[PDB]
């Protein structure tokens, strides 16, 4: 009886195995755009993905992860609110059963169809497992998805999903360029928070881009054909794999822009 997104094991249950679910810096949150303060001391984000080395795509039973070689400084995030250098390890998405829900963060209570998370770890902690034990261990770049025009740089991801339909399936996934998933603007909001899935560790500097990317209805439909279940288990569509907004508590969201 492991955590998930169903009636009996969904986000309102997680606190029983992971009491930090009710902690002081949980994610996601609603971004109230009128209360976020412009911080003119915040630097432009530096997204350096030209040498990124993707390896593999994995269905882990709660999303799919595109994994990268993080054994050297090849794809790094720096600048913005960050001190030092954060290495890209994986990206994944959260999405809905319907185009009106799926994002984890919300903007003035608006839900997007999906949310991309580019996960990075602070190189001063040496590995990801050490970094998640630190309050500044991770930097997650969050990008909203809205349904409209197709995102051409997403299609290589969409087309491999048939090969990883069920929990525990993986496929080689080399030479994928994550620059093709970024919007034009790197204007962002930032706040201190957590992993949005168990173990819900309070180790994340969240950086959420203001400009969504557009994906097509056909692209997001292909996400919704994935399965939470393993092969030969009853089919349960991988949809609504999002945690809702958590209390902001004693936090301020800062804006990089006016
Ligand atoms: N790599 C490493 C290096 C040295 C030693 C140990 C390791 N650890 C692993 O290999 C490993 C760690 C965790 C794991 N599952 C739970 C978890 O912590 N998920 C992360 C996550 C959850 C959530 C988010 S979100 N949605 O962006 O907030 C973003 C990220 C599975 C595998
Ligand atoms: Zn995520």
Curated annotation (Swiss-Prot):
Effect of residue 65 to H: Enhanced proton transfer
Mutagenesis or variant effect for residue 60 to V: Reduced activity
Effect in UniProt of substituting residue 117 to E: Strongly reduced activity
Biological processes, Gene Ontology terms: angiotensin-activated signaling pathway; carbon dioxide transport; morphogenesis of an epithelium; neuron cellular homeostasis; positive regulation of cellular pH reduction; positive regulation of dipeptide transmembrane transport; positive regulation of synaptic transmission, GABAergic; regulation of chloride transport
GO molecular function: arylesterase activity; carbonate dehydratase activity; cyanamide hydratase activity; zinc ion binding
Marked site positions, Involved in the binding of some activators, including histamine and L-histidine: 90
Gene3D superfamilies: Alpha carbonic anhydrase
Effect ascribed to mutating residue 5 to F: Enhanced activity
Alpha-carbonic anhydrase domain residues: 1-257
The keyword Glycoprotein belongs to this UniProt entry's keyword annotation: no
Effect of residue 104 to A/Q: Strongly reduced CO(2) hydrase activity
pH-activity dependence text: Optimum pH is 6-8.
One cellular component (GO) term of this entry: plasma membrane
Residues with site note (Fine-tunes the proton-transfer properties of H-64): 5, 60, 65
Co-factor remark: Zinc. Can also use cobalt(II) with lower efficiency, but not copper(II), nickel(II) and manganese(II).
Effect of residue 63 to S: 2-fold decrease in enzyme efficiency, as determined by kcat/KM ratio, and efficiently inhibited by chlorzolamide
Regulation: Activated by X-ray, histamine, L-adrenaline, L- and D-phenylalanine, L- and D-histidine, L-His-OMe and beta-Ala-His (carnosine).
Record's function text: Catalyzes the reversible hydration of carbon dioxide. Can also hydrate cyanamide to urea. Stimulates the chloride-bicarbonate exchange activity of SLC26A6. Essential for bone resorption and osteoclast differentiation. Involved in the regulation of fluid secretion into the anterior chamber of the eye. Contributes to intracellular pH regulation in the duodenal upper villous epithelium during proton-coupled peptide absorption.
Other notes: Target of drugs used in treatments against glaucoma disorder and breast cancer.
Protein name according to UniProt: Carbonic anhydrase 2
Protein source organism: Homo sapiens (Human)
Lineage of origin: Eukaryota, Metazoa, Chordata, Craniata, Vertebrata
């Amino acid at each position: 009886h492991h955590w998930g997104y169903g009636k009996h094991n969904g986000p309102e249950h997680w606190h029983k195995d992971f009491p930090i679910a009710k902690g002081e810096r949980q994610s996601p949150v609603d971004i109230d755009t009128h209360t976020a303060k412009y911080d003119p001391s915040l630097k432009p984000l530096s997204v350096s993905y030209d040498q990124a080395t993707s390896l593999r795509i994995l269905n882990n039973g709660h999303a799919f992860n595109v994994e990268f070689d993080d054994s050297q400084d090849k794809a790094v995030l720096k600048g913005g609110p960050l001190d030092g250098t954060y290495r890209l390890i994986q990206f994944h998405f959260h999405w809905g059963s319907l185009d009106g829900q799926g994002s984890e963060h919300t903007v003035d209570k608006k839900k997007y169809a999906a949310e991309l998370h580019l996960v990075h770890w602070n190189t001063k902690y040496g590995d990801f497992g050490k970094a998640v034990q630190q309050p500044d261990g991770l930097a997650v770049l969050g990008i909203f998805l809205k349904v409209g025009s197709a995102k051409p740089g997403l299609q290589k991801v969409v087309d491999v999903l048939d090969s990883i339909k069920t929990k525990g399936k993986s496929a080689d996934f080399t030479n994928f360029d994550p620059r093709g998933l970024l919007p034009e603007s790197l204007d962002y909001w930032t706040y201190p928070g957590s992993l949005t899935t168990p173990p819900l560790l309070e180790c994340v500097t969240w950086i959420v881009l203001k400009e969504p990317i557009s994906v097509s209805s056909e692209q997001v439909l292909k996400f919704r054909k994935l399965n939470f279940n393993g092969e030969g288990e009853p089919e349960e569509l991988m949809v609504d794999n999002w945690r809702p907004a958590q209390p902001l508590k004693n936090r301020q969201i800062k804006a990089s822009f006016k």
